[PDB]
């Protein structure tokens, strides 16, 4: 398990919108119409796109280019 | 639905009202009873409000869902779902225009007060018993003119035209529309400028306000009164057919009905043009049948159809507990959760808890079912629910691979503070309990002794990803209101730790030198080596001092094997001397503290970790028990006893002898026994603590005992010196119900026995305490809860405001030393400016930082004293704080981030703590160092002393490298040594005064000239013989005589030649009015000295707190000064004498009422400053903040509580109590004009945009001044701008009524708003999508 | 004592109270306040619809969790949509605003 998220909030320093992008990210990858940029260790979605933003592959900006795209 | 904000209410126009309508109901019937269809027009009818069941038709010719907006041909029901049906409304054409009874009968009359005409005259007229001439045109009648029957019969035969009256709702309307806005509230301005009187001033303004809230909002008056009325939609009021062909109704069904009734009549009795008397009854009629459907209880009641109990109009269902928000939106049931007891679980890791297989199944259902599904193991729902209830491997094997990163919430009945729900990682094990990981217990408050824990499961996605990131047990280390660690090892962990470090002078492998730690474990796991034992090893520490590189240093240290097995663990950054001692509570806290701060969290965690296992590990190693011999009765006890009885006995019989009182004789005997008590405890105490004497290879020695209870005490794992007393010493002395203390105590101990007074007494003890903490608990609860309430709303709004506004915060040192550094007063403020060195222009710290540890360590090398930071309270922003004003303190380090609802976790912080909490003659310098004298103005007299003349002296102390350690306060008159520069020796005197008498010192010589002296009539001479003793009282204005009551006697101080000697520099004659109680001793006849006597002057905890909040006014408050200079007497003797302060350079006209029994500390011609005492005692709050202003109340308020919380231990930062304060004075009163209304008192909010609008105005205005106003917690929160939020608890009516008059908008800017419209509270993962819908509008 | 999904309340249409009929736990005040206290505004989302009171939005949610996805769907509360129309009901004009 992910136990702590330090990182991610180090990318976003508001910490809230932190949650908003993640969510939208492993919302787009719960209901298929995306892929994970990530190799999966058996974690479920959540965790995986925390685990992808803490990378620096994903962030509001990069899910705005891709969406129009 | 729409996505929207800023809810408004205003009157609904007849035009509005027939929008939202769908249809017209005009029969009253509903059903036909026989057959269950719906009738036609109705009040339930199909073709109009809908379908009764969902896509079909009546007469059940269409019925598939297919059909969607077909008509049926034989019903001309349209196909379409039911729910339709609960939302569409009607309406009613009314022949008469009604009068809305919300707006008329509102205990304050709008209607009546716009009008300017009272409430019985409104009563009068609508029930039709006398006329009143509205606007008779050109003749001798005015407008609210009262009109009999044959008066108004006279009037019509003599004035057939130019005669115009009316009656009801309608008249109402009529005069209504009719009234001109702008000139009335144009004459009304005349008149306010004309006239000066209270009342009259208050009724004006109040009605002119209401003008102005008609005219900005733009609402028409004539909309109060209704035309058309709409009606409920069927199934808000159902009519369900019970089993049995019979029906159940609700009352709205009955109203409906006889509403429509009575207006079918009316209309018919229209048509048929029937006399005016029954067509005006039956208006009334139909005005109490409607008014009874909007609010049933303002007339006579009408009961329902033969059922006795009152029916239950419109607003009961809004208003009240019962109806609506009060209870709907307020405390519920939720699913997918459960409940159960509480286990240990040492195996788990920090972030996890064991969770017992059958209760994750049970919640996890529908996961379970889902998975199933989407693997194919199961065709169908019901074959899933069939293999769940077989309970078949699969089902294990879905259910753990559903849960690995799934987290779950874990609550505890009395969530305190935010950490009593966190979230963890489940662990699936068998049982039936929960197991909660030791560590957080201290957070949760929880004990294993039957309590038990509920769990709740995060469903939407949004709730796991906030669940993981912002709850999980990990994140939350630091406490939010200290920045303490929460958890530290509590009571095990400490010991096993402590028996691991501590050494011992001899033992097995003695003096071995070892190549590290791995052998050191070698030896001692093989047995080879005593765990604690005094070595040599080899050990390579790092330090990142460089830029992040760690350097290795690697020494010989001399340590124990302990010491080296625990070193193992400890992460790379530390330096080893952290755990070279002996390794206590304090000692592992701090360690944790410096490995936070220096590597960051996940070492620390892990860190942490490891700590616990160790410990767990090797107490259970050592094998501490507690045996009977353990506990050592002290050899010398019984002799100190008997002793102590002999010494009572010895008083007993000197006191039957009658030379000391029985009072005297019970302290003397308390005092003894007490110093008997602490002989006995410090006896034990030497003889367990430090007893075993134990012998290296020759010689003996003597070292800290291994006796297992002096390990557990001094360890801080159980217990306090007090119970080891208690265990082995006497119990001390016991309080009788009344609080005094019983002569004899209780000399055994629980190692011995009691005997049943003993035992009886403690037993009083127990209970009276345990009765405390239940009270204290309630009170604790309902004050925290007013807290919560008050400051819900305050929210981080902004980056930074920009203002150069802060407070000067200093060390609080009270008298003897620094009680509190000023490192840790100011870790994580922003800085107002740039403090400099002791020599200017040495920039220590550039504009606004914040102060982190570092930069904290970096004062304390330098000599900072006092240091200007930017405060919550001289926050700039509007409608929140900024970032910067606030700070960084939190969970995590860093400055605070945009939206977080700071004021729900200050009021958490400072309420949830609260539950345990129950001579003076010379001055003693503690520590060498300067003395030096702040706010005096001294003249040296003869005798070489630096004589006090001000009352607000004060004698701090610099140290040797300029530093203020001790300070305190002089009083006027008190015999002073030593002046200023001069440094005095360690404890040295350096000033004397009379503790209970407080003398009035001379400047110069000479002889005491008697002016209003006079003897008799104000004073009364008892004077003894040659040797100058005397009874002169000057009396004070209480206790002066009745005949010398007014008149105010007086000292010249003159010299040997008469002349009145002047105070040197200035040219004042000494006209020293004798105050209060002036003792004249030394009679006339005797040279005066300079310093002659002339006048001698003789709760806290939890309702303390909570007292401070609500800002009581303690009943004898002290006076202060508003001005400086000359004060003087006026009027005499009218019941409460008068002082008129007149300033030297200011207008005189202050005048201050001062009852009789007040003695006065200063004299009439003398120098006073602004806010200097002039009575003693408690100050309120309010004349503090008036006259000093803001800082001075905040500075106040936090020392008063800071105080309190501190006596108890229990740190909390001051941020909390300053949010709070902000909270506290939101309103402010104009005091000038220029836009307002001269008087009323409006929030700093508002009063902030105007000024900003009329000074951006290049006209603008000479601009509105105003004066702050501090209101208690409760009015205050009572005070809420938000209808919304007043709407939630108070009178529901009153408000909803003003604020659909005044045209108020609510932007909801809350959370309490949020909440009830159901919507994401701005605060923290919801800011963002308020914050996105704020990007929504004004955009693309 | 445990329940997922189980009978509710005749009137309010709250999950029944105790441990012999199925029984959810008493989600107080207090408890929300500390959830404030936190960032938490999907929780409290949830658990003030989703949760117990809304029929339709614990059908759906039961359905979307059936058809294994982990999301919901937002909007006002109907029985805020119910306050609307009752408050409307009286003299008051009370709208919704848009921008
Ligand atoms: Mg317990
Ligand atoms: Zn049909
Ligand atoms: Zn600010």
Same mark, same amino acid.
């Given at each position: 398990?992910?136990?702590?998220?330090?990182?991610?909030?180090?990318?976003?320093?508001?910490?809230?919108?932190?949650?908003?992008?993640?969510?939208?990210?492993?919302?787009?990858?719960?209901?298929?119409?995306?892929?994970?940029?990530?190799?999966?260790?058996?974690?479920?979605?959540?965790?995986?796109?925390?685990?992808?933003?803490?990378?620096?592959?994903?962030?509001?900006?990069?899910?705005?280019?891709?969406?129009?795209? | 639905?729409?996505?929207?904000?800023?809810?408004?209410?205003?009157?609904?126009?007849?035009?509005?009202?027939?929008?939202?309508?769908?249809?017209?109901?005009?029969?009253?019937?509903?059903?036909?009873?026989?057959?269950? +269809?719906?009738?036609?027009?109705?009040? =339930?009818?199909?073709?109009?409000?809908?379908?009764?069941?969902?896509?079909?038709?009546?007469?059940? $010719?269409?019925?598939?869902? +297919?059909?969607?907006?077909?008509?049926?041909?034989?019903?001309?029901?349209?196909?379409?779902?039911?729910?339709?049906?609960?939302?569409?409304?009607?309406?009613?054409?009314?022949?008469?225009?009604?009068?809305?009874?919300?707006?008329? $009968?509102?205990?304050?009359?709008?209607?009546?007060?716009?009008?300017?005409?009272?409430?019985?005259?409104?009563?009068?007229?609508?029930?039709?018993?006398?006329?009143?001439?509205?606007?008779?045109?050109?003749?001798?009648?005015?407008? /609210?003119?009262?009109?009999?029957?044959?008066?108004?019969?006279?009037?019509?035969?003599?004035?057939?035209?130019?005669?115009?009256?009316?009656?009801?709702?309608?008249?109402?309307?009529?005069?209504? +529309?009719?009234?001109?806005?702008?000139?009335?509230?144009?004459?009304?301005?005349?008149?306010?400028?004309?006239?000066?009187?209270?009342?009259?001033?208050?009724?004006?303004?109040?009605?002119?306000?209401?003008?102005?809230?008609?005219? /900005?909002?733009?609402?028409? %008056?004539?909309?109060?009164?209704?035309?058309?009325?709409?009606?409920?939609?069927?199934?808000?009021?159902?009519?369900?057919?019970?089993?049995?062909?019979?029906?159940?109704?609700?009352?709205?069904?009955?109203?409906?009905?006889?509403?429509?009734?009575?207006?079918?009549?009316?209309?018919?009795?229209?048509?048929?043009?029937?006399?005016?008397?029954?067509?005006?009854?039956? +208006?009334?009629?139909?005005?109490?049948?409607?008014?009874?459907?909007?609010?049933?209880?303002?007339?006579?009641?009408?009961?329902?159809?033969?059922?006795?109990? %009152?029916?239950?109009?419109?607003?009961?269902?809004?208003?009240?507990?019962?109806?609506?928000?009060?209870?709907?939106?307020?405390?519920?049931?939720?699913?997918?959760?459960?409940?159960?007891?509480?286990?240990?679980?040492?195996?788990?890791?920090?972030?996890?808890?064991?969770? %017992?297989?059958?209760?994750?199944?049970?919640?996890?259902?529908?996961?379970?079912?889902? $998975?199933?599904?989407?693997?194919?193991?199961?065709?169908?729902?019901?074959?899933?629910?069939?293999?769940?209830?077989?309970?078949?491997?699969?089902?294990?094997?879905?259910?753990?691979?559903?849960?690995?990163?799934?987290?779950?919430?874990?609550?505890?009945?009395?969530?305190?503070?935010?950490?009593?729900?966190?979230?963890?990682?489940?662990?699936?094990?068998?049982? $039936?309990?929960?197991?909660?990981?030791?560590?957080?217990?201290?957070?949760?408050?929880?004990?294993?002794?039957?309590?038990?824990?509920?769990?709740?499961?995060?469903?939407?996605?949004?709730?796991?990803?906030?669940?993981?990131?912002?709850?999980?047990?990990?994140?939350?280390?630091?406490?939010?209101?200290?920045?303490?660690?929460?958890?530290?090892?509590?009571?095990?962990?400490?010991?096993?730790?402590?028996?691991?470090?501590?050494?011992?002078?001899?033992?097995?492998?003695?003096?071995?030198?070892?190549?590290?730690?791995?052998?050191?474990?070698?030896?001692?796991?093989?047995?080879?080596?005593?765990?604690?034992?005094?070595?040599?090893?080899?050990?390579?520490?790092?330090?990142?001092?460089?830029?992040?590189?760690?350097?290795?240093?690697?020494?010989?240290?001399?340590?124990?094997?302990?010491?080296?097995?625990?070193?193992?663990?400890?992460?790379?950054?530390?330096?080893?001397?952290?755990?070279?001692?002996?390794?206590?509570?304090?000692?592992?806290?701090?360690?944790?503290?410096?490995?936070?701060?220096?590597?960051?969290?996940?070492?620390?965690?892990?860190?942490?970790?490891?700590?616990?296992?160790?410990?767990?590990?090797?107490?259970?190693?050592?094998?501490?028990?507690?045996?009977?011999?353990?506990?050592?009765?002290?050899?010398?006890?019984?002799?100190?006893?008997?002793?102590?009885?002999?010494?009572?006995?010895?008083?007993?019989?000197?006191?039957?002898?009658?030379?000391?009182?029985?009072?005297?004789?019970?302290?003397?005997?308390?005092?003894?026994?007490?110093?008997?008590?602490?002989?006995?405890?410090?006896?034990?105490?030497?003889?367990?603590?430090?007893?075993?004497?134990?012998?290296?290879?020759?010689?003996?020695?003597?070292?800290?005992?291994?006796?297992?209870?002096?390990?557990?005490?001094?360890?801080?794992?159980?217990?306090?010196?007090?119970?080891?007393?208690?265990?082995?010493?006497?119990?001390?002395?016991?309080?009788?119900?009344?609080?005094?203390?019983?002569?004899?105590?209780?000399?055994?101990?629980?190692?011995?026995?009691?005997?049943?007074?003993?035992?009886?007494?403690?037993?009083?003890?127990?209970?009276?305490?345990?009765?405390?903490?239940?009270?204290?608990?309630?009170? #604790?609860?309902?004050?925290?809860?007013?807290?919560?309430?008050?400051?819900?709303?305050?929210?981080?709004?902004?980056?930074?405001?920009?203002?150069?506004?802060?407070?000067?915060?200093?060390?609080?040192?009270?008298?003897?030393?620094?009680?509190?550094?000023?490192?840790?007063?100011?870790?994580?403020?922003?800085?107002?400016?740039?403090?400099?060195?002791?020599?200017?222009?040495?920039?220590?710290?550039?504009?606004?930082?914040?102060?982190?540890?570092?930069?904290?360590?970096?004062?304390?090398?330098?000599?900072?004293?006092?240091?200007?930071?930017?405060?919550?309270?001289?926050?700039?922003?509007?409608?929140?704080?900024?970032?910067?004003?606030?700070?960084?303190?939190?969970?995590?380090?860093?400055?605070?981030?945009?939206?977080?609802?700071?004021?729900?976790?200050?009021?958490?912080?400072?309420?949830?703590?609260?539950?345990?909490?129950?001579?003076?003659?010379?001055?003693?310098?503690?520590?060498?160092?300067?003395?030096?004298?702040?706010?005096?103005?001294?003249?040296?007299?003869?005798?070489?002393?630096?004589?006090?003349?001000?009352?607000?002296?004060?004698?701090?102390?610099?140290?040797?490298?300029?530093?203020?350690?001790?300070?305190?306060?002089?009083?006027?008159?008190?015999?002073?040594?030593?002046?200023?520069?001069?440094?005095?020796?360690?404890?040295?005197?350096?000033?004397?005064?009379?503790?209970?008498?407080?003398?009035?010192?001379?400047?110069?010589?000479? =002889?005491?000239?008697?002016?209003?002296?006079?003897?008799?009539?104000?004073?009364?001479?008892?004077?003894?013989?040659?040797?100058?003793?005397?009874?002169?009282?000057?009396?004070?204005?209480?206790?002066?005589?009745?005949?010398?009551?007014?008149?105010? %006697?007086?000292?010249?101080?003159?010299?040997?030649?008469?002349?009145?000697?002047?105070?040197?520099?200035?040219?004042?004659?000494?006209?020293?009015?004798?105050?209060?109680?002036?003792?004249?001793?030394?009679?006339?006849?005797?040279?005066?000295?300079?310093?002659?006597?002339?006048?001698?002057?003789?709760?806290?905890?939890?309702?303390?707190?909570?007292?401070?909040?609500?800002?009581?006014?303690?009943?004898?408050?002290?006076?202060?000064?508003?001005?400086?200079?000359?004060?003087?007497?006026?009027?005499?003797?009218?019941?409460?004498?008068?002082?008129?302060?007149?300033?030297?350079?200011?207008?005189?006209?202050?005048?201050?009422?001062?009852?009789?029994?007040?003695?006065?500390?200063?004299?009439?011609?003398?120098?006073?400053?602004?806010?200097?005492?002039?009575?003693?005692?408690?100050?309120?709050?309010?004349?503090?903040?008036?006259?000093?202003?803001?800082?001075?109340?905040?500075?106040?308020?936090?020392?008063?509580?800071?105080?309190?919380?501190?006596?108890?231990?229990?740190?909390?930062?001051?941020?909390?109590?300053?949010?709070?304060?902000?909270?506290?004075?939101?309103?402010?009163?104009?005091?000038?004009?220029?836009?307002?209304?001269?008087?009323?008192?409006?929030?700093?909010?508002?009063?902030?945009?105007?000024?900003?609008?009329?000074?951006?105005?290049?006209?603008?205005?000479?601009?509105?001044?105003? #004066?702050?106003?501090?209101?208690?917690?409760?009015?205050?929160?009572?005070?809420?701008?938000?209808?919304?939020?007043?709407?939630?608890?108070?009178?529901?009516?009153?408000?909803?009524?003003?604020?659909?008059?005044?045209?108020?908008?609510?932007?909801?800017?809350?959370?309490?708003?949020?909440?009830?419209?159901?919507?994401?509270?701005?605060?923290?993962?919801?800011?963002?999508?308020?914050?996105?819908?704020?990007?929504?509008?004004?955009?693309? | 004592?445990?329940?997922?999904?189980?009978?509710?309340?005749?009137?309010?249409?709250?999950?029944?109270?105790?441990?012999?009929?199925?029984?959810?736990?008493?989600?107080?005040?207090?408890?929300?306040?500390?959830? *404030?206290?936190?960032?938490?505004?999907?929780?409290?989302? @949830?658990?003030?619809?989703?949760?117990?009171?809304?029929? &339709?939005?614990?059908?759906?949610?039961?359905?979307?969790?059936?058809?294994?996805?982990?999301?919901? @769907?937002?909007?006002?509360?109907?029985?805020?949509?119910?306050?609307?129309?009752?408050?409307?009901?009286?003299?008051? &004009?009370? @709208?919704?605003?848009? *921008?």
């Amino acid at each position: 398990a992910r136990v702590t998220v330090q990182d991610a909030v180090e990318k976003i320093g508001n910490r809230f919108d932190l949650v908003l992008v993640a969510a939208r990210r492993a919302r787009q990858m719960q209901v298929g119409g995306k892929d994970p940029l990530v190799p999966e260790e058996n974690d479920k979605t959540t965790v995986i796109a925390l685990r992808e933003i803490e990378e620096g592959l994903i962030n509001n900006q990069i899910l705005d280019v891709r969406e129009r795209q | 639905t729409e996505e929207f904000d800023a809810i408004k209410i205003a009157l609904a126009s007849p035009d509005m009202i027939r929008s939202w309508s769908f249809g017209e109901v005009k029969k009253p019937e509903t059903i036909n009873y026989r057959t269950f +269809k719906p009738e036609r027009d109705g009040l =339930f009818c199909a073709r109009i409000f809908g379908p009764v069941k969902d896509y079909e038709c009546l007469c059940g $010719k269409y019925k598939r869902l +297919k059909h969607r907006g077909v008509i049926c041909e034989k019903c001309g029901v349209e196909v379409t779902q039911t729910k339709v049906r609960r939302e569409r409304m009607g309406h009613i054409e009314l022949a008469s225009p009604t009068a809305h009874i919300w707006f008329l $009968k509102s205990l304050p009359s709008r209607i009546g007060l716009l009008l300017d005409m009272p409430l019985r005259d409104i009563e009068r007229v609508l029930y039709f018993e006398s006329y009143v001439v509205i606007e008779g045109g050109m003749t001798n009648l005015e407008r /609210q003119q009262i009109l009999t029957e044959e008066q108004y019969l006279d009037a019509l035969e003599e004035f057939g035209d130019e005669f115009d009256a009316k009656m009801g709702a309608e008249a109402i309307q009529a005069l209504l +529309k009719s009234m001109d806005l702008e000139q009335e509230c144009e004459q009304l301005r005349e008149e306010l400028n004309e006239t000066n009187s209270e009342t009259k001033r208050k009724k004006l303004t109040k009605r002119i306000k209401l003008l102005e809230a008609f005219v /900005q909002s733009g609402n028409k %008056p004539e909309w109060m009164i209704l035309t058309v009325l709409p009606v409920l939609p069927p199934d808000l009021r159902p009519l369900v057919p019970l089993d049995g062909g019979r029906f159940a109704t609700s009352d709205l069904n009955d109203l409906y009905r006889r509403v429509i009734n009575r207006n079918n009549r009316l209309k018919r009795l229209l048509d048929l043009a029937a006399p005016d008397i029954i067509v005006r009854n039956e +208006k009334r009629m139909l005005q109490e049948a409607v008014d009874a459907l909007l609010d049933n209880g303002r007339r006579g009641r009408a009961i329902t159809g033969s059922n006795k109990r %009152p029916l239950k109009s419109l607003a009961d269902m809004i208003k009240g507990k019962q109806g609506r928000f009060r209870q709907n939106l307020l405390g519920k049931r939720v699913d997918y959760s459960g409940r159960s007891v509480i286990t240990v679980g040492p195996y788990l890791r920090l972030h996890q808890c064991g969770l %017992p297989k059958k209760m994750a199944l049970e919640l996890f259902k529908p996961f379970i079912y889902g $998975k199933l599904e989407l693997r194919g193991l199961a065709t169908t729902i019901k074959a899933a629910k069939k293999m769940v209830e077989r309970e078949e491997a699969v089902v294990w094997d879905i259910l753990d691979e559903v849960i690995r990163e799934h987290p779950v919430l874990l609550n505890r009945a009395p969530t305190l503070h935010r950490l009593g729900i966190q979230a963890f990682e489940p662990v699936l094990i068998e049982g $039936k309990a929960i197991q909660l990981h030791p560590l957080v217990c201290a957070a949760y408050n929880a004990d294993f002794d039957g309590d038990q824990m509920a769990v709740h499961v995060p469903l939407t996605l949004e709730a796991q990803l906030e669940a993981r990131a912002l709850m999980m047990s990990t994140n939350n280390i630091l406490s939010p209101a200290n920045g303490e660690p929460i958890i530290v090892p509590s009571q095990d962990v400490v010991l096993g730790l402590y028996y691991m470090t501590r050494d011992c002078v001899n033992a097995k492998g003695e003096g071995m030198v070892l190549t590290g730690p791995k052998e050191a474990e070698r030896l001692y796991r093989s047995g080879l080596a005593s765990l604690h034992a005094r070595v040599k090893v080899r050990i390579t520490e790092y330090e990142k001092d460089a830029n992040g590189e760690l350097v290795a240093k690697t020494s010989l240290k001399d340590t124990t094997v302990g010491r080296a097995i625990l070193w193992m663990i400890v992460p790379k950054g530390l330096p080893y001397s952290i755990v070279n001692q002996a390794l206590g509570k304090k000692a592992i806290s701090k360690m944790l503290n410096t490995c936070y701060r220096i590597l960051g969290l996940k070492p620390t965690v892990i860190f942490a970790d490891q700590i616990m296992y160790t410990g767990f590990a090797y107490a259970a190693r050592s094998g501490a028990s507690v045996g009977i011999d353990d506990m050592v009765i002290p050899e010398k006890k019984h002799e100190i006893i008997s002793e102590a009885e002999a010494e009572v006995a010895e008083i007993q019989e000197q006191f039957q002898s009658g030379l000391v009182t029985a009072g005297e004789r019970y302290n003397k005997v308390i005092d003894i026994w007490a110093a008997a008590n602490d002989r006995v405890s410090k006896a034990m105490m030497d003889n367990l603590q430090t007893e075993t004497v134990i012998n290296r290879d020759g010689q003996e020695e003597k070292q800290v005992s291994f006796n297992s209870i002096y390990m557990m005490a001094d360890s801080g794992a159980r217990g306090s010196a007090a119970q080891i007393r208690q265990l082995a010493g006497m119990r001390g002395l016991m309080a009788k119900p009344d609080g005094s203390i019983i002569e004899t105590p209780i000399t055994a101990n629980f190692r011995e026995g009691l005997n049943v007074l003993q035992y009886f007494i403690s037993t009083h003890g127990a209970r009276k305490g345990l009765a405390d903490t239940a009270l204290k608990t309630a009170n #604790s609860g309902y004050l925290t809860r007013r807290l919560v309430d008050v400051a819900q709303d305050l929210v981080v709004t902004e980056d930074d405001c920009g203002t150069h506004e802060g407070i000067m915060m200093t060390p609080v040192i009270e008298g003897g030393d620094v009680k509190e550094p000023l490192r840790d007063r100011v870790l994580g403020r922003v800085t107002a400016e740039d403090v400099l060195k002791p020599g200017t222009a040495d920039i220590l710290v550039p504009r606004n930082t914040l102060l982190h540890e570092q930069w904290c360590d970096l004062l304390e090398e330098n000599s900072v004293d006092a240091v200007k930071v930017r405060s919550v309270v001289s926050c700039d922003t509007d409608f929140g704080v900024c970032a910067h004003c606030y700070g960084r303190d939190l969970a995590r380090g860093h400055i605070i981030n945009k939206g977080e609802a700071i004021g729900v976790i200050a009021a958490q912080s400072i309420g949830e703590p609260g539950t345990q909490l129950t001579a003076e003659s010379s001055i003693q310098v503690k520590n060498k160092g300067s003395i030096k004298l702040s706010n005096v103005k001294s003249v040296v007299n003869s005798s070489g002393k630096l004589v006090i003349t001000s009352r607000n002296t004060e004698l701090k102390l610099i140290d040797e490298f300029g530093r203020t350690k001790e300070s305190y306060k002089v009083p006027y008159g008190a015999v002073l040594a030593k002046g200023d520069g001069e440094q005095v020796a360690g404890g040295e005197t350096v000033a004397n005064w009379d503790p209970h008498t407080m003398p009035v010192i001379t400047e110069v010589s000479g =002889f005491v000239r008697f002016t209003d002296m006079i003897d008799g009539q104000t004073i009364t001479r008892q004077t003894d013989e040659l040797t100058g003793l005397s009874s002169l009282v000057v009396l004070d204005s209480a206790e002066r005589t009745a005949g010398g009551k007014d008149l105010r %006697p007086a000292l010249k101080i003159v010299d040997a030649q008469g002349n009145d000697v002047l105070i040197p520099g200035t040219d004042m004659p000494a006209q020293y009015f004798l105050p209060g109680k002036a003792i004249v001793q030394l009679e006339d006849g005797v040279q005066i000295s300079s310093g002659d006597t002339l006048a001698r002057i003789p709760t806290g905890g939890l309702p303390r707190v909570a007292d401070l909040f609500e800002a009581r006014r303690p009943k004898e408050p002290a006076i202060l000064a508003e001005i400086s200079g000359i004060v003087s007497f006026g009027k005499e003797t009218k019941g409460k004498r008068r002082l008129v302060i007149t300033p030297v350079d200011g207008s005189d006209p202050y005048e201050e009422m001062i009852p009789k029994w007040r003695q006065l500390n200063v004299f009439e011609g003398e120098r006073v400053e602004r806010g200097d005492v002039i009575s003693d005692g408690p100050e309120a709050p309010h004349d503090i903040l008036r006259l000093r202003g803001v800082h001075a109340v905040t500075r106040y308020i936090v020392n008063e509580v800071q105080d309190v919380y501190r006596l108890q231990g229990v740190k909390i930062n001051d941020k909390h109590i300053e949010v709070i304060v902000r909270q506290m004075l939101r309103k402010a009163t104009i005091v000038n004009a220029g836009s307002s209304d001269f008087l009323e008192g409006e929030q700093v909010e508002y009063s902030r945009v105007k000024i900003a609008n009329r000074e951006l105005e290049a006209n603008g205005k000479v601009g509105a001044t105003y #004066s702050r106003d501090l209101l208690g917690i409760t009015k205050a929160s009572l005070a809420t701008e938000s209808f919304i939020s007043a709407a939630s608890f108070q009178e529901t009516t009153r408000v909803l009524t003003e604020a659909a008059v005044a045209g108020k908008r609510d932007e909801l800017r809350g959370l309490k708003e949020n909440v009830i419209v159901g919507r994401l509270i701005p605060a923290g993962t919801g800011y963002a999508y308020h914050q996105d819908r704020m990007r929504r509008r004004a955009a693309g | 004592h445990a329940r997922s999904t189980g009978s509710y309340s005749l009137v309010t249409q709250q999950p029944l109270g105790g441990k012999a009929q199925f029984g959810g736990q008493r989600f107080g005040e207090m408890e929300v306040w500390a959830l *404030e206290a936190y960032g938490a505004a999907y929780t409290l989302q @949830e658990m003030l619809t989703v949760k117990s009171d809304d029929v &339709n939005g614990r059908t759906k949610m039961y359905k979307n969790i059936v058809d294994g996805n982990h999301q919901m @769907e937002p909007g006002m509360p109907e029985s805020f949509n119910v306050l609307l129309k009752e408050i409307r009901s009286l003299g008051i &004009n009370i @709208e919704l605003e848009d *921008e």
